[PDB]
């Protein structure tokens, strides 16, 4: 009777899991699987051939870390099973065969991804029911709105989905593959100018931590260049795990800048501001004002200081002067996708939209295409 549903927002970098109804995710941990790369010499030591999640970042210096999901597409279908097993048994401590599960996905992904997710859920873990939903839609549920264009940016993909009164405009959906992982790689590349060298997958985590703790979005890129070149006030220090101290200057705001100028990492695509403006323009003329008044930002990549201010500045420059540009950046936007998923899964109206085991048994893995979205 009172069978609580499961919401598993399995992103490219972090896995968010919990129960439908809770305020915050129960388990958050990196989506990595590590394997030993050295020689084991002590006989009788605990021999594990795989480390998943937080356990793989504690024994991080003797492992090779591999993300099973890149750009929102699952490339390794055994590491992903390992991660799902960890999430279900070792993190949530629940039996997968007695809880309906809700999964999230990027807007434009290959259909094979959804089909294999369906097959794995219904044949390996034997879930009673399943549903796959768009993260950008769940962001609106979290924000408590029915109208607005949402800018979701994790570390695999960045996408915009405009919605008006619960109606989505598919032709105005945009998808970019520039995200937090590319930001980390660009920072790791530009750190070599000062002398610091990070190559290993273990050092990639250190670079990501430096990015998260020191990087910010500059409102005026040229002036911030001038200030950084003329003074050391913008310089900050960070201590490496071995005790060495590094100092970074203009990199703090050069690294996040690639969001607005993707040409830095060699991409021809436009910035997030231009992408959002084009997505708004693709919609109907009447919808545009309400879309301007409601810009919802979600994802970890949107957590840089000043990103909302610069986004408002750029969209104000692009948009007509009469229109009022409002950037909605909730403080908990890092978990808005999961919160919206929980709200959606906790609705009575949603309980007849689950894909049940009988329908899968009679239709095959293609039932998800006609049921979910």
């Amino acid at each position: 009777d009172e069978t609580t549903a499961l919401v598993c927002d399995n992103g490219s970098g972090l896995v968010k899991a919990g129960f439908a109804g809770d305020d915050a995710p129960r388990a958050v941990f990196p989506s990595i699987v590590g394997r030993p790369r050295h020689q084991g010499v002590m006989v009788g030591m605990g021999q594990k051939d795989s480390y998943v999640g937080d356990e793989a970042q504690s024994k991080r210096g003797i492992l090779t870390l591999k993300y099973p999901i890149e750009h929102g597409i699952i490339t390794n279908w055994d590491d992903m099973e390992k991660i799902w097993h960890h999430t279900f048994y070792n993190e949530l401590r629940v039996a997968p065969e007695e809880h309906p599960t809700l999964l999230t996905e990027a807007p434009l992904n290959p259909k094979a991804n959804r089909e294999k997710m369906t097959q794995i859920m219904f044949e390996t873990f034997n879930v009673p029911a399943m549903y796959v939903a768009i993260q950008a839609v769940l962001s609106l549920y979290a924000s408590g709105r029915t109208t607005g264009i949402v800018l979701d940016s994790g570390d695999g993909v960045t996408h915009n989905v405009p919605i008006y009164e619960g109606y989505a405009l598919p032709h105005a959906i945009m998808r970019l593959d520039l995200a937090g992982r590319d930001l980390t790689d660009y920072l790791m590349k530009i750190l070599t100018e000062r002398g610091y060298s990070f190559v290993t997958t273990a050092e990639r985590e250190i670079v990501r931590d430096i990015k998260e703790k020191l990087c910010y979005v500059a409102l005026d890129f040229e002036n911030e260049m001038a200030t950084a070149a003329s003074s050391s006030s913008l310089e900050k220090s960070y201590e490496l795990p071995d005790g060495q101290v590094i100092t970074i200057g203009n990199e703090r705001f050069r690294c996040p800048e690639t969001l607005f100028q993707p040409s830095f990492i060699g991409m021809e695509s436009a910035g997030i501001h231009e992408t959002t403006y084009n997505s708004i323009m693709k919609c109907d003329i009447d919808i545009r004002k309400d879309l301007y008044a409601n810009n919802v930002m979600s994802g970890g990549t949107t957590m840089y200081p000043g990103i909302a201010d610069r986004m408002q500045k750029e969209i104000t420059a692009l948009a007509p002067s009469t229109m009022k540009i409002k950037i909605i950046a909730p403080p908990e936007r890092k978990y808005s996708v999961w919160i919206g998923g929980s709200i959606l899964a906790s609705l009575s109206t949603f309980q007849q939209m689950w894909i049940t085991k009988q329908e899968y048994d009679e239709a095959g893995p293609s039932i998800v295409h006609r049921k979910c979205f």
Partner: protein
Amino acid sequence: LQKGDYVWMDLKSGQEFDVPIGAVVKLCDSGQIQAVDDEDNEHWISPQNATHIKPMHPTSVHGVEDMIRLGDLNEAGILRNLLIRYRDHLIYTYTGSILVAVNPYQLLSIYSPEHIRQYTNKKIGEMPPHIFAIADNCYFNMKRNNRDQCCIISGESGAGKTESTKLILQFLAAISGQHSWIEQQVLEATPILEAFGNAKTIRNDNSSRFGKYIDIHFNKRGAIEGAKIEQYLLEKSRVCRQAPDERNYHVFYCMLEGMNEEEKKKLGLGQAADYNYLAMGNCITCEGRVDSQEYANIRSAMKVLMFTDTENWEISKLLAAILHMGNLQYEARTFENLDACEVLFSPSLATAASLLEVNPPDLMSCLTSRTLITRGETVSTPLSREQALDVRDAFVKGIYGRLFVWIVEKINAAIYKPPPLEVKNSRRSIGLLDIFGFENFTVNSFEQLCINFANEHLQQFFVRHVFKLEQEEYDLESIDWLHIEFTDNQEALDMIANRPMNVISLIDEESKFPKGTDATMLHKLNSQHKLNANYVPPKNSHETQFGINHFAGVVYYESQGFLEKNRDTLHGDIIQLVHSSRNKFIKQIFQADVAMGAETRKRSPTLSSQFKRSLELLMRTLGACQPFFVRCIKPNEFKKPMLFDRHLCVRQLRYSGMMETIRIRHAGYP
């Protein structure tokens, strides 16, 4: 379909230990069995659920002494047969070659000198079942085939195991012409040995924590030439650590209260709550006994067994020293990038040295240091806080174990009467073994694992004996049996202690492995034994329980507690301190050790290693003798003369292993 019949009515109650009750049929409408299930219950059975009704076989209808020939050979039939006999004051029953005795909780009159001679020279089945009959046939077969015999008494704690041992000895006393003063001594030995060998558990106030063997040696064409008491499988983890709602051995409590205050003052004893070795169980007083009265019984029994007042004072001081060392407190120290200890000052430390009659500086160094004593130098090494607690507890367990051996030796000296062995026909012994039974508590620990491991050997010994007398014997005379399957069950034993990578050694290996924890031990057990069907791995990583499929069933043991109980580390410095002690008694009980000179103390046989070797020695003794099996069942938990709890009983039937006899009947010719 008739009325007033006996029909097996099968309730769908969700309790784990549920079997059909059966009841007499009443009235006529629908099922309407009722008229007491077996006590007073009503069941308005409908026609739709009449499938719960199965007509009952006439052999099951009236209680039959031999359960082997019972019509419905099922747990429900066997449970029921006990029930009519118990309600009729019959507390004995056969299962082919196994006696089943139910503790009456009342002084019945089935035992008398007339009953001795009445059952004398009577084969099994010649008379109603009786504990005398097992004793008589054991005595008769003894001289008939010139082979040593053995009787194995086992069951749940408080089911009458100790009493049955007394009655068997009483019968063997009377079958001999002379009164045989030995038995009176054996009864006098019981209060002393039970005091040092039993303790209170969550289930019973007086629970046996070791195996008792009474080797009553029989002279040629005669009886009770001599008797030897040998102890096995003594639980020693209890001396230092007690489970909640359980308390240490009764000696410490009986000694601490009910002694002259001046005697306590010399020993330094106070109350019982002060000592952690006696109060961590959080139950000092056990309702239903006045331990001070036991102290008089203990001391008086000692006086009969040539225990002089000097000896008891020597014994009391050693027990006194045990308690004071228990209250010693250790604090962590860092020394020089190492691990060091510091015993906080307390009156217990000074008292312990005085009781042990050792130099206080020598006691401090021995507790907080170790010496290599390699050839050419000594080299002293500091101990960590965890290691310091280990050597302190190992010393405490070492004293109590050797003290227990000395008491058995002292009792043996006055009753053994060494038989003249110049003749090749030395004597024809009849061993009496009082052993614990299988338990499956809510929380099972290292103690239960070794206890459950022991019954695996006994059950295998029991199964082989039954199998030999099964179609392997009674078919062999007339009927073919080679087609019939007689497979054994050694896979469980192989996983536990009889194969490389067995469970016990993985516990021993993880005890000494660097940075070893209970969590790491569980991972080793899971990695090695995941594929084995007998092993049930924990479902999650956070779960700290592993399941082992014993003969009775799947039993889950808590990983926490291991690697702490199974560490008996006695360094060479411990024996050196004992040798230099002024006290002669402490040197006397360490006599084998004080002849030291071996650096093999890295072995320092752990509680697992000692338990296995004791079990192997026990099994060799039973192996040499033809076995007789007796099962004792407590009908109810609140001591009452007439109250038969079904769920409690059937649990004991399943855990006893008696059901294997019934199973091999179905495989053969039922």
